[PDB]
Every structure is written in C-alpha cells, then in structure tokens.
C-alpha cells in the first residue's frame, strides 16, 4: 500500500505545524506526534511527515525508494514568522488591481472582520488535544478510511493558516495546502509508477537540477467535466406536481454529478483530494498525465455518453476535456496557469459543439414506433409510460420527494429509485437504511448532506420544517392571511465569476492552491452559509452555487432575504464581488418554466450595465441594492405604511395619478395629498418625491409594495 502511505503522509505532512504553534522543526514535531499513534506509525507516513523539506531530506539516510521525496516535491509545488497569526481572507488579494488590498482575517461558518486578531496558544493546544483524541480511536489507516481522514482534516484545519510567514499573505489554509499537496503527490506517484522509476532521489532530488527539470516536465492533467441540460431538466416541467419535484430534480442532478466524479476517481485509484472543484454541473480535477489515466478518461467519457444516450437521449449530456499541465504551470512561475484553464475551457466548449457522433445521430432517427402516450412532467414518449401518465423518471423523482424531507442520507446502490450510471440507483434513505444497504452489498456509496462522503448542498425548504405544511410544498408559501398570494422567484448570479477566477487573483498570487481555496470558499458560502442566511423565511432553495442561484418562496420573504443575502455576500467577499439578481412575482399554478424564463430575463436585465442591480418585478424596476433597501423600502415604504396603518384605494389613486406625468396630474396629486388626512410633512415629502425623476419611480415601487402587502 505504498500509494496509501504516500497519501496519508502527504495529507499529514504539516500536522506538526499545529503542534509547533501550540508550543525543533515542525517536521520533526509532526513526526513525533504521529509516532505517538501506532496505526499512523507506518513507514511512509512518518517518513513523509519528517523529511518533506530540503534540510531534512539531504541527511535523511533513506533507501531512495521512500515516498518522502514525492511528498517534498508536492509540498514545494503546492506552496510555491508570527506563530500567533490569523488566516487571511482569500478575497484580500482578489480584484486588488482595482479595489485594493484589504486586511480581512478570520478569527479562531466564519466571516472575515478586518480587525487585529491573534490565535491564542491555548486554542492551538485545544486543537492539538482534539486531533490526538480523534486520531487515537476515531480514525484508522486503510483504503476506505482515507475519505474519513480527508473529511476530518477539512473539518479541523479549514481555518488554520498553512504558513505563518509574515512576508507572504496567509490566504491559503492548512487544509487547502494539505489537500493540494496530497493530490499533487498522488499524481506524481502515478507518473513515476508509469515511468518505472525505482530511485525517486536520483530521479528528482539528488542533483537539485533534476527537481527543476521535473518541474519543467509535464506531469499533470487539468480535467473539466461539464454536464449540459441541467436547467431544462429542472425547470422545463409541466403539471400540478412539478413544484414538489423542482428540488428533487436538482438534487438528483447534483448527486448524479457527484456519482460521476466518484466513479472517475475510483477508476484512477484517487481520492477526493484530486477533485479541485464541483459546482453547477462542472467538476475540475487534477489527474496524473499517464497513458493509463488518459485511457481511463477516454473510457469514462465513452461510457457516460452511452449511458446518457440510453437514459436521457439528448436531454442530459456530459463532456470531459483534459489538458496536459506542468509543475511550473501549477506554480504559475511562467504565467501559463490562466492560459491552461482557458485552454481546458475552450476544449470543453469544442467538445460540447460536436456533441454526438455519426452512429448516435443515425440511431436518434431510427424511432421504430410512434410515441403514443407520453408522461406529464416529461414530454417524452420514447420512455415507457406508466399509468397516471408518469415516465420512468419523474416516477421515482416524486419518490425521492417526500423522502428527502424524511431522510438525510443519499444511497447509490444496485437497487434504488432513480437511475444512475454503471447500472446503479439513487435512493434517499435514513441512517439505518443506509447501513442496511452497505451491509447487503458492497460498492454502495453513502452521501451525507451537510454533515460516507459528505456533500455540501443548500437544501433549505421551509415547507419541510412544519409537518402540517410539509405535504403542500412551495404552494404552501402562498397560504397567507395578509398580502397578495404570490410566489417570489429569485434568480441570482455573480458577475464575472469566471473572470474573477482567471484574473481577479493577480499573477504574483495566482496558483493552484489559491484557486482551490477560492473555489472552496465560494462553495462553502453558497452551500452552507446560505441556509443560515435564509433562516426563518418561507423560501425553498432550488439551486445554489453562486454561478446559478434559484430560490422560490414568498415574494416579500424573497425580497427581504435577497437584501440580506446581498449584505452577507458583501461581508463574505469583503467587497470586490458584485451580486446581481432578478426577482419575479408570479401566481400559483403559473408554469414553472415560465417563472424561470421571466426571472431569467429579469436577471439578464439586471446584469447589463452596472452589473450590481436588481430587477424587482418588471423592466422598469431596475434598482440598486442600497437604493432598494434604503430609498424604496426604508425611506418611502416604511413612512407610508406607518401613516396608513389600510388606505388601499388611496394608494391606487396615487398610483393612477403617478402613472401620468402630465402637470395636471401633478396638481391632482397635490390635491389628493391635501385631502389624504395624513401628516403634512409626509405630504410634502411625497410631493417632492413625485416631482423629482428617479424618486417618483422609487415612490411608485414603495406604493406597489405596500399595496401588495395590504392585499387580501
């Protein structure tokens, strides 16, 4: 198990830094700390921890076959003295070319605060004690235990700085550094095994020039796996049962993407460390640049194409594009890192262009018999349709519904509910059921939700919280005693997110570990903190990730939580990241595809120009976030609500007067304000707002909001 030893050593190579900060070199301290534990006393792990730096590696006196050389070179590639120093926010360096360099740091989900802070040695001692207790009994060494070790490392070291060098910035966390070092070490081990290298020292370390040569040798593969058809699969559904299936379809697609990633990693005998990013249908991975890896990629691509053709025809598809990457490219010494990622994306797009082959196109038009009956949510008739007109999928998606609320684990097993590649099935099940599935058969995968493999996904649904309204679902949101019964749909997206990845981090800071840290921070914000942001609101989170954010709930709750989310996103990114969203208000039984399309066009309207705007209900409601929060609501809506508390007919008269800009209507509005029997100063304020352009629109929006709030 030399590969497993290298994995364990590379993940834990800097475990001694925590002990050192708790208060010899950190490598020796970590070696002693790991030697305290018998299971981790294996030669490879302790050798990697002890001798991953040049000073110790020079006089290690090893057999030249040790994985310590690979650990050292992976640490050099990944990383390429205030003991009580905090973790610097990654966004401090992003967009620093324009909006400057900030001083936000994390205190020992956490928000940077931009304040002077230190990590107390007592805190590090407590962390060391926690690590000792967890390693003594709860953790073990083995092929199946490395996933648990990675999850434990992510849970503990996520906010521990990787290095405390004062000259450099502390953006990269200890967990990010360890994970990137482990992934690079695994790739280098696979490369050397493919090249039949016996003496690692003589290969890279011994002359000290072969290390630079290996840095110049192409060893890695940047792989992008893109799933297309997600939006149409989720939202293009028709029927009265579509609202209950809205979240189930998105969850099924996310779990399918995770299953694809896990299958690809298992074929390559790699762990989740090599999985750099997983978002809205995209998966970025770092693989070895071996012939075996390329053959595995080709076989996986062909098999996935065949499975998606068999199950979904042209509805859903997946593509895989890989580009050969160098150690210098990972370290960005030359500057080709952004070029590498752009090349990967362009190759992925080129593959998405010529998506199907000759034989597949010919088989598409074979269509032996007519469709006849077709299912309700799916306008597919090729699939065999059951009674009540439900297709094989969406009959099982509905079963995943009413069980996602009840159960917490997602089981990929030989028998289940929704089909998955390699002849598997996804089923939502509880703890006992998942354990039963594992006991009955192997190769069964368990996915925990925000807690096996842990998946970070926003699953906030206010309907499931109340047992009485659980069966109703999203429609339960329109059940209200005051206010117009409507559903608010929020379609939000980060502006220039890919551009921020490519150029937001300057060339002097861009690297693989920086990209991993930034992607992990964005994923943690949009999969974990979003649920805490939306607490107590009648909102159902259908899709997350920041790249494509879709929520549905009550219209006023959606607007309020959109304002709160904008403020929290400004806090989390410490500025330097704009946030544009489109809000729509639709009745129940309105087509879900229609709601999605209208909110999408509102989102596109908000995107153009300032790229920091909100389309509230139509093309005339493009406002700023501060303008909507302060001017429309706080400065105008609140005084009118206070004065009128119903005055619905009075507000309708004001609206019909404001819709006409003729000066006679101005005089009529003055007379109406005179006859309104409210405070004179507020009448003057309303008249001034009406007179001034760009304030009359805010007044009209406030009046409409109040009317919608006072409806029956």
């Amino acid at each position: 198990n030399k590969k497993l030893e290298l994995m364990y050593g590379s993940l834990l190579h800097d475990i001694g830094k925590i002990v050192y900060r708790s208060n010899g070199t950190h490598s020796k301290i970590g070696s002693q700390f790991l030697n305290k534990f018998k299971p981790f006393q294996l030669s490879g792990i302790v050798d990697s921890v002890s001798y991953h730096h040049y000073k110790e590696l020079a006089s290690s006196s090893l057999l030249d076959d040790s994985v310590a050389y690979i650990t050292y070179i992976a640490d050099n590639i990944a990383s390429g003295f205030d003991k009580r120093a905090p973790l610097a926010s990654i966004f401090n360096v992003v967009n620093s070319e324009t909006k400057g360099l900030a001083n936000y740091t994390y205190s020992f989900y956490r928000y940077p605060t931009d304040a002077k802070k230190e990590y107390t040695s007592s805190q590090y001692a407590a962390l060391v004690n926690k690590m000792t207790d967890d390693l003594s009994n709860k953790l073990k060494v083995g092929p199946d235990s490395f996933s648990s070790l990675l999850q434990w490392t992510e849970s503990l070291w996520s906010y521990i700085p990787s290095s405390t060098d004062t000259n450099q910035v502390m953006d990269v966390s200890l967990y990010d550094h360890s994970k990137i070092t482990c992934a690079i070490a695994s790739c280098i081990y696979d490369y050397l095994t493919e090249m039949n290298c016996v003496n690692y020292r003589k290969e890279l370390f011994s002359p000290y020039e072969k290390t630079k040569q290996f840095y110049q040798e192409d060893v890695f593969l940047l792989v992008s796996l893109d799933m297309s058809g997600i939006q149409d699969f989720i939202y293009n559904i028709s029927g009265s049962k579509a609202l209950k299936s809205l979240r189930s379809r998105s969850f099924y697609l996310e779990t399918m993407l995770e299953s694809l990633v896990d299958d690809l990693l298992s074929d390559l005998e790699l762990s989740r460390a090599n999985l750099l990013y997983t978002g809205g249908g995209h998966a970025y991975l770092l693989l070895p640049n071996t012939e075996r890896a390329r053959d595995v990629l080709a076989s996986f691509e062909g098999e996935m194409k065949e499975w998606f053709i068999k199950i979904f025809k042209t509805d859903l598809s997946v593509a895989i594009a890989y580009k050969a990457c160098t150690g210098e490219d990972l370290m960005n010494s030359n500057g080709t890192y952004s070029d590498l990622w752009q090349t990967v994306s362009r190759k992925l797009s080129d593959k998405k262009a010529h998506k199907y082959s000759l034989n597949e196109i010919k088989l598409f038009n074979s269509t032996i018999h007519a469709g006849t009956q077709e299912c309700k949510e799916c306008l597919r008739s090729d699939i065999d349709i059951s009674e009540d007109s439900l297709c094989k999928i969406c009959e099982g998606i509905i079963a995943i519904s009413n069980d996602l609320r009840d159960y917490s684990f997602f089981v990929v097993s030989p028998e289940g509910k929704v089909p998955l590649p390699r002849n598997r099935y996804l089923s939502v099940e509880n703890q006992d059921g998942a354990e039963r599935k594992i006991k009955m058969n192997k190769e069964t995968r368990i996915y925990s939700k925000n807690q096996v493999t842990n998946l970070w996904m926003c699953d906030y649904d206010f309907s499931t919280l109340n047992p009485e309204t659980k069966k109703q679902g999203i429609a339960s949101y329109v059940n209200r005693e005051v206010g117009i019964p409507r559903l608010g749909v929020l379609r939000a997206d980060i502006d220039n997110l890919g551009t921020t990845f490519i150029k937001g981090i300057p060339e002097q800071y861009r690297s693989i570990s920086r990209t991993a840290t930034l992607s992990r921070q964005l994923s943690m914000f949009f999969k974990f903190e979003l649920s805490n942001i939306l607490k107590g609101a009648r909102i159902s989170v259908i899709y997350s990730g920041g790249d494509d954010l879709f929520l549905i709930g009550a219209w006023d709750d959606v607007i309020s939580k959109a304002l709160v989310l904008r403020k929290a996103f400004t806090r989390f990114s410490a500025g330097k990241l704009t946030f544009s969203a489109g809000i729509g208000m639709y009745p129940v039984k309105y087509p879900i595809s229609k709601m999605a399309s209208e909110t999408g066009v509102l989102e596109d309207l908000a995107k153009r120009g300032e790229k920091n705007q909100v389309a509230l209900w139509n093309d005339s409601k493009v406002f700023g976030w501060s303008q909507l929060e302060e001017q429309i609501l706080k400065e105008k809506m609140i005084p009118l609500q206070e004065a009128l508390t119903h005055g619905k007919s009075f507000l309708y008269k004001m609206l019909e007067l404001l819709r006409n800009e003729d000066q006679i209507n101005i005089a009529r509005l003055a007379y109406l304000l005179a006859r309104s029997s409210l405070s004179e100063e507020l009448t003057q304020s309303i008249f001034a707002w009406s007179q001034n352009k760009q304030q009359k629109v805010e007044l009209i929006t406030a009046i409409e909001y109040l009317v919608y709030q006072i409806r029956e």
Partner: protein, 113 residues
C-alpha cells in the same frame, strides 16, 4: 407652474393663511359657475357659453367686492383677466386650459393649507 408660484408667494402664517384668509367656502359659488360652464362646453365656444363667461366675470367682481380674501385671490391669480383672454381667443381648448389653471390653483391652495 405659475399657479404654484402665485399660491406660494402669498402663503403666510399667523395657522397657514392664504390670500388673507381665503377658504374654499368663499370659492364655492365661483367653482360652481365654472363647473357649469365647463360641463356646457364639454357637452358640445357658443353664444350661451360667452354669456356664461361674461356672467362669470360679473360674479368674479361681485365676490371680489363682497370678500377681501376673494379680491386678493382674484387680483393675484388674474382669473378674470384669463376669462377675458378666453373670451377674446374664443376656442374651447383655451377654455379647457383656463379650467385646468383654475383647478391647479385651487388644488395648490388646498395643498399648502
């Protein structure tokens, strides 16, 4: 917005007082006559309309003599002179504009109360 300016310039505080104590009660008869003429015009200037406008000017003078506040309002806002202008031009659009001007005057007078 000449009406707004002419109603603002004479706004004083003693209780906001407009035109030395003008109230809508003093303008009720004038408003009634103007409404009658406006309805007659809208239903259809005519000879009877011109006679109505001349009687309106006579009533303007009578109310100006009766109440000092009405006199101040009339001399400030040039309502009777605009009636003469409407009589001279003798087009229904000008009378509609005069009615809109009087409506704006009374609306702004109530607005600053």
């Amino acid at each position: 917005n000449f009406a707004r300016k002419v109603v603002e310039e004479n706004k004083r505080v003693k209780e906001i007082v407009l035109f030395n104590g003008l109230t809508t009660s003093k303008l009720r008869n004038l408003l009634e006559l103007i409404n009658h003429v406006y309805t007659k015009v809208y239903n259809s200037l005519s000879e009877d309309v011109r006679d109505e406008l001349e009687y309106l000017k006579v009533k303007f003078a009578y109310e100006s003599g009766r109440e000092p506040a009405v006199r101040t309002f009339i001399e400030k806002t040039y309502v009777d002179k605009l009636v003469d202008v409407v009589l001279k031009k003798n087009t229904k659009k000008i009378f509609l504009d005069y009615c809109k001007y009087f409506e704006a005057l009374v609306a702004y007078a109530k607005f600053y109360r």
